[PDB]
């Protein structure tokens, strides 16, 4: 039980770090999607 609890707590810590970098990735993807839509409109006008 003690080993299971320690492994669970280590899993909580590493899973929180994984969540942290996961929404870091998600915020990066949202920012990229917005800036790519803006740049796609900008570059289509600039090519035309």
């Amino acid at each position: 039980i003690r080993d299971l609890e320690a492994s669970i707590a280590r899993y909580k810590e590493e899973y929180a770090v994984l969540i942290s970098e996961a929404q870091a990735i998600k915020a990066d993807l949202a920012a990229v999607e917005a800036k790519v839509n803006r740049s796609t409109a900008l570059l289509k006008s600039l090519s035309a």
Partner: peptide
């Protein structure tokens, strides 16, 4: 976690 919870409930 599901396996660990099931094992804890069994024991």
């Amino acid at each position: 976690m599901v396996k660990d919870q099931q094992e804890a409930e069994k024991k």
